[PDB]
Design an enzyme around this catalytic site. Structure first.
Site, mmCIF file in Angstrom:
data_model
loop_
_atom_site.group_PDB
_atom_site.id
_atom_site.type_symbol
_atom_site.label_atom_id
_atom_site.label_comp_id
_atom_site.label_asym_id
_atom_site.label_seq_id
_atom_site.Cartn_x
_atom_site.Cartn_y
_atom_site.Cartn_z
ATOM 1 N N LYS A 24 2.646 -11.370 1.850
ATOM 2 C CA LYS A 24 2.684 -10.640 0.584
ATOM 3 C C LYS A 24 3.663 -11.313 -0.360
ATOM 4 C CE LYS A 24 0.630 -6.825 2.435
ATOM 5 N NZ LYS A 24 -0.804 -6.577 2.129
ATOM 6 N N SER A 39 -7.549 -11.857 5.560
ATOM 7 C CA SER A 39 -7.775 -10.664 4.759
ATOM 8 C C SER A 39 -7.601 -10.915 3.279
ATOM 9 C CB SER A 39 -6.842 -9.554 5.227
ATOM 10 O OG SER A 39 -6.979 -9.406 6.636
ATOM 11 N N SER A 86 -4.154 -3.409 -0.610
ATOM 12 C CA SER A 86 -2.970 -3.934 0.044
ATOM 13 C C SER A 86 -2.136 -2.816 0.664
ATOM 14 C CB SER A 86 -2.113 -4.713 -0.974
ATOM 15 O OG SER A 86 -0.937 -5.240 -0.371
ATOM 16 N N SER A 126 -5.974 -9.158 0.891
ATOM 17 C CA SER A 126 -4.930 -8.447 0.144
ATOM 18 C C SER A 126 -4.075 -9.270 -0.830
ATOM 19 C CB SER A 126 -4.033 -7.661 1.109
ATOM 20 O OG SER A 126 -3.092 -8.476 1.800
HETATM 21 C C1 LIG Z 1 -3.403 -8.978 2.979
HETATM 22 O O1 LIG Z 1 -4.511 -8.746 3.470
HETATM 23 C C2 LIG Z 1 -2.372 -9.826 3.744
HETATM 24 C C3 LIG Z 1 -3.007 -11.068 4.152
HETATM 25 C C4 LIG Z 1 -3.182 -11.991 2.984
HETATM 26 O O2 LIG Z 1 -2.293 -11.657 5.293
HETATM 27 C C5 LIG Z 1 -2.839 -12.731 5.968
HETATM 28 C C6 LIG Z 1 -4.282 -12.939 5.711
HETATM 29 O O3 LIG Z 1 -2.230 -13.434 6.743
HETATM 30 C C7 LIG Z 1 -1.933 -9.072 5.003
HETATM 31 N N1 LIG Z 1 -1.966 -7.694 4.465
HETATM 32 C C8 LIG Z 1 -2.843 -6.791 5.117
HETATM 33 C C9 LIG Z 1 -3.007 -5.403 4.645
HETATM 34 O O4 LIG Z 1 -2.473 -4.878 3.705
HETATM 35 O O5 LIG Z 1 -3.861 -4.830 5.473
HETATM 36 C C10 LIG Z 1 -3.402 -3.654 6.255
HETATM 37 C C11 LIG Z 1 -4.449 -2.940 7.035
HETATM 38 C C12 LIG Z 1 -4.804 -3.136 8.170
HETATM 39 C C13 LIG Z 1 -3.489 -7.315 6.171
HETATM 40 S S1 LIG Z 1 -3.102 -9.034 6.456
#
Ligand SMILES: *C(=O)[C@H]([C@@H](C)OC(C)=O)[C@H]1NC(C(=O)OCC=C)=CS1
Length: 239
Positions: A69, A12, A202, A14
């Site tokens: 995060k 993802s 995020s 974020s």
């Molecule tokens: C952001 O997308 C982080 C990612 C970088 O984590 C990974 C890829 O391992 C995580 N945070 C989220 C987010 O905020 O999404 C929530 C909604 C479903 C998903 S993975």
């Protein structure tokens, strides 16, 4: 001291632009082993996140998923997020409702267009994120918004963040801590306030609260590989 490493796929966006979808990182688990007076008896110790560390942890509301995060708030911090300026204010050790005056140095560089455009599907008139694209700065993509980028320095840690200039958090949907106004949180002992670098994309502590130390898995240490397709230029440190 024997550390344990675990690789993680990044599915993802974020944590953009720091970590991109397709990056494959290496994570150093917080729990490690040490050989007792020398030797026998392998003992297990546990390290802790430093402010600004990129951390992998088990999502509190569903521990079956691992989130990644940045640990922007440490135990005891009074964390405030201004949804308009999209800037953090952090006051270490201000956990007793006292009118604190101390303040972690948190500074921001000037906003500049980023390399990314976030697109949205035009589902019957409305919108739904359809992805992120790297687009030359002199070009545009229809149904896409060019993201803004700037550097955020937390104490002595500097990193990038991306913001969606047409968006603003609805403070009313934040997790609201007992005794606090919306958008202000006091991090509990042994807990952490996590925020993604792609600030408007995020679902982090602002919405669901703190991450207990028990849920921490580890600290991201490197981008070991990256695919979008190979992106060897991304292998190396995380910055
Ligand atoms: C952001 O997308 C982080 C990612 C970088 O984590 C990974 C890829 O391992 C995580 N945070 C989220 C987010 O905020 O999404 C929530 C909604 C479903 C998903 S993975």
């Amino acid at each position: 001291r024997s550390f344990i490493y675990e690789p993680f796929q990044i599915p993802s966006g974020s944590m953009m632009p720091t970590l991109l979808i397709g990056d494959f990182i290496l994570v150093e688990k917080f729990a490690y082993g040490i050989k007792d007076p020398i030797y026998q008896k392998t003992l297990i110790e546990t390290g802790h996140p430093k402010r600004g560390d990129i951390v992998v942890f088990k999502y509190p509301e569903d521990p079956k998923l691992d989130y990644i995060k940045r640990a922007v708030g440490l135990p005891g911090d009074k964390v405030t997020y201004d949804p308009v300026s999209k800037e953090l204010t952090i006051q270490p050790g201000c956990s007793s409702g006292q009118a604190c005056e101390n303040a972690l140095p948190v500074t921001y560089s000037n906003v500049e267009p980023s390399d990314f455009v976030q697109t949205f599907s035009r589902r019957n008139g409305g919108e739904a994120t359809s992805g992120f694209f790297e687009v030359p700065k002199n070009e545009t993509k229809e149904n896409g918004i060019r993201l803004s980028e700037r550097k955020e320095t937390l104490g002595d840690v500097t990193h990038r963040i991306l913001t969606v200039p047409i968006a603003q958090d609805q403070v009313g949907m934040y997790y609201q801590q007992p005794g606090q106004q919306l958008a202000t949180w006091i991090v509990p002992p042994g807990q952490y306030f996590m925020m993604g670098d792609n600030r408007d994309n995020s679902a982090d502590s602002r919405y669901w609260g703190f991450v207990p130390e028990a849920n921490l898995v580890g600290r991201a240490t490197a981008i070991w590989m990256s695919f979008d397709g190979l992106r060897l230029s991304r292998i190396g440190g995380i910055h």
